Enzyme design. Structure first.
Site, PDB file in Angstrom:
ATOM      1  N   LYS A 211      50.568  35.718  24.187  1.00 19.91           N
ATOM      2  CA  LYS A 211      49.756  36.734  23.514  1.00 19.91           C
ATOM      3  C   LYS A 211      48.277  36.440  23.592  1.00 19.91           C
ATOM      4  CE  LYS A 211      53.144  38.617  20.381  1.00 19.91           C
ATOM      5  NZ  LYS A 211      53.394  39.052  18.987  1.00 19.91           N
ATOM      6  N   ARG A 245      60.354  33.466  19.432  1.00 18.70           N
ATOM      7  CA  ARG A 245      60.521  34.551  20.416  1.00 18.70           C
ATOM      8  C   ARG A 245      59.619  34.283  21.596  1.00 18.70           C
ATOM      9  NH1 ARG A 245      58.168  39.542  21.845  1.00 18.70           N
ATOM     10  NH2 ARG A 245      59.617  41.298  22.209  1.00 18.70           N
TER      11      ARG A 245
HETATM   12  C1  LIG Z   1      58.997  43.166  19.569  1.00 15.58           C
HETATM   13  N1  LIG Z   1      58.006  42.145  19.273  1.00 15.58           N
HETATM   14  C2  LIG Z   1      56.861  41.863  19.962  1.00 15.58           C
HETATM   15  S1  LIG Z   1      56.445  42.781  21.389  1.00 15.58           S
HETATM   16  C3  LIG Z   1      54.783  42.211  21.850  1.00 15.58           C
HETATM   17  C4  LIG Z   1      54.879  41.008  22.783  1.00 15.58           C
HETATM   18  O1  LIG Z   1      56.012  40.589  23.151  1.00 15.58           O
HETATM   19  O2  LIG Z   1      53.741  40.559  23.075  1.00 15.58           O
HETATM   20  N2  LIG Z   1      56.192  40.870  19.405  1.00 15.58           N
HETATM   21  C5  LIG Z   1      56.957  40.516  18.325  1.00 15.58           C
HETATM   22  C6  LIG Z   1      56.736  39.494  17.352  1.00 15.58           C
HETATM   23  O3  LIG Z   1      55.785  38.737  17.289  1.00 15.58           O
HETATM   24  N3  LIG Z   1      57.756  39.462  16.436  1.00 15.58           N
HETATM   25  C7  LIG Z   1      58.863  40.296  16.400  1.00 15.58           C
HETATM   26  N4  LIG Z   1      59.717  40.048  15.354  1.00 15.58           N
HETATM   27  N5  LIG Z   1      59.074  41.222  17.290  1.00 15.58           N
HETATM   28  C8  LIG Z   1      58.086  41.279  18.222  1.00 15.58           C
END
Ligand SMILES: Cn1c(SCC(=O)O)nc2c(=O)[nH]c(N)nc21
Length: 266
Positions: A211, A245
């Site tokens: 990010k 994640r």
């Molecule tokens: C779907 N999603 C994304 S998408 C943007 C990317 O992957 O940069 N970021 C997050 C996060 O930080 N937490 C959760 N819980 N879900 C997320």
């Protein structure tokens, strides 16, 4: 501390790695990618069929279902791995739960019409992620008097909101939502104070992989962010984050083993 879904359990006594599966043959590539991530150590696969970027040209229900539901289905009828879905839409929540999804991961914390009730009715674990505003506009001028406090307050309110709709506290996960209506300072303030979100006694989920909080600090593009991403993962897991994640599973799992060995010894 555990989670229960689809008749199996996830044991959060140690950190878990969540592998990102972006779906935006499509179906054959995705299954392969989910396979590669399971072998690499990922214990949750996160299926996401709607871009969450600041640009944010939203997708229809029929297209989100087309992208997501076959993929969740395929995965649940090969592998034993837990499955999470990135959706805001009640019909995608309902449908992915029927075909074997384990976790509802909504960046909008079930704020859409019918989403809260659809989640309640599935009985599945729900992730409550903080975002100031909405994806279209959240990054233009993120502002807090006190970012930690406002995110803290947000979890208090949403936990109640979910309880009142019949979702038990035991189903919830919290996530301060790095990059979702936050500048660089805001993001690092939250990361430095992340351990303080344990007072809710709920699993913390975090997502910093590749990010802008890494990109803007190092001034590099998205493919040059792995070291910064592993640093963010380790910093978060040392503070007891339960789920990480990430894009880069093998490397994140290696780093988490080092964290597990360290936390075992404490
Ligand atoms: C779907 N999603 C994304 S998408 C943007 C990317 O992957 O940069 N970021 C997050 C996060 O930080 N937490 C959760 N819980 N879900 C997320």
């Amino acid at each position: 501390m555990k989670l229960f879904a689809q008749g199996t359990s996830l044991d959060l006594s140690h950190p878990h790695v969540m592998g990102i599966l972006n779906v935006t043959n499509s179906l054959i590539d995705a299954v392969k990618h989910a396979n590669l991530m399971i072998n690499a150590g990922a214990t949750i696969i996160d299926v996401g069929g709607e871009s969450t970027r600041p640009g944010a040209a939203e997708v229809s229900v029929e297209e989100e279902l087309q992208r997501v539901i076959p993929v969740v289905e395929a995965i649940a009828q090969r592998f034993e791995v837990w499955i999470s879905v990135d959706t805001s839409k009640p019909e995608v929540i309902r449908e992915s739960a029927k075909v074997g999804a384990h976790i509802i991961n909504d960046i909008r914390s079930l704020s859409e019409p019918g989403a809260l009730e659809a989640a309640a009715e599935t009985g599945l674990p729900v992730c409550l992620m903080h975002m100031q505003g909405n994806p279209k506009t959240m990054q233009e001028a993120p502002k807090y008097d006190d970012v930690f406090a406002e995110v803290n307050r947000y979890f208090i309110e949403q936990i109640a909101r979910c309880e009142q709709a019949g979702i038990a506290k035991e189903k919830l996960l919290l996530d301060p939502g790095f990059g979702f209506g936050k500048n660089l300072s805001h993001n690092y303030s939250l990361l430095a104070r992340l351990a303080e979100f344990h007072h809710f006694n709920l699993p913390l989920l975090v997502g910093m992989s590749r990010k802008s909080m890494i990109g803007q600090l190092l001034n590099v593009g998205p493919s040059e962010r792995l070291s910064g991403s592993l640093a963010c993962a380790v910093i978060a897991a040392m503070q007891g984050a339960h789920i990480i994640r990430v894009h880069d599973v093998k490397e994140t799992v290696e780093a988490m083993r080092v964290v597990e060995a360290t936390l075992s010894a404490k």
